[PDB]
Amino acid sequence: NQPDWADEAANGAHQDAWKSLKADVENVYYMVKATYKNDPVWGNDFTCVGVMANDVNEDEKSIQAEFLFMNNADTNMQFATEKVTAVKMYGYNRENAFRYETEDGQVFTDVIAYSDDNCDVIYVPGTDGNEEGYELWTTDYDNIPANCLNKFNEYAVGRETRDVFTSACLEIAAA
Ligand SMILES: NCCc1c[nH]cn1
Numbered sequence: 544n545q546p547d548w549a550d551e552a553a554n555g556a557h558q559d560a561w562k563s564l565k566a567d568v569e570n571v572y573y574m575v576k577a578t579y580k581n582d583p584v585w586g587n588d589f590t591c592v593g594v595m596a597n598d599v600n601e602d603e604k605s606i607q608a609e610f611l612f613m614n615n616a617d618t619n620m621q622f623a624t625e626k627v628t629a630v631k632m633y634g635y636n637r638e639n640a641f642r643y644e645t646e647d648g649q650v651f652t653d654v655i656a657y658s659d660d661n662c663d664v665i666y667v668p669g670t671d672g673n674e675e676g677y678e679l680w681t682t683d684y685d686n687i688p689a690n691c692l693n694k695f696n697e698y699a700v701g702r703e704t705r706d707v708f709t710s711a712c713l714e715i716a717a718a
Pocket residue numbers: 582583584585625643651653667
């Protein structure tokens with residue numbers, strides 16, 4: 544049993560997890576939308592989630608990721624560092640998932656449903672003590688690519704979509 548988009552022959556070309564993780568090294572990726580409200584790490588009604596990486600390890604297909612985020616329990620931006628490794632899920636031959644490992648050893652395995660050069664549509668299976676759902680991440684929180692947005696809306700049908708990282712997360716300019 545697995546999502547119908549988890550068809551490697553059909554969709555694998557757009558589900559390259561290692562390529563997507565390395566992309567976090569060049570540009571910050573912002574989670575612009577999601578279909579769920581709570582994350583065990585980011586908190587409740589979490590918003591303003593972004594990530595940047597460094598320390599690419601080709602032998603391990605892992606990076607060190609630095610996250611920023613907000614939730615309804617603190618008015619200040621929060622930060623955390625986690626290791627993320629490209630792994631295989633749903634019988635795939637080429638890595639199509641992200642295995643996050645927090646400093647306390649907690650593990651989350653999410654799956655790339657669709658990914659293009661500057662955006663990712665990620666599926667949260669809901670088996671890591673968390674809510675099942677989808678996330679949309681992109682490098683520019685103000686200009687969302689239509690291809691990823693359409694794929695996110697397509698796969699996330701029947702749920703309640705909400706904004707996560709938007710310009711409201713920052714107070715931009717001066718004076
Ligand atoms: N679906 C996001 C799970 C996660 C990873 N790190 C923190 N939370």
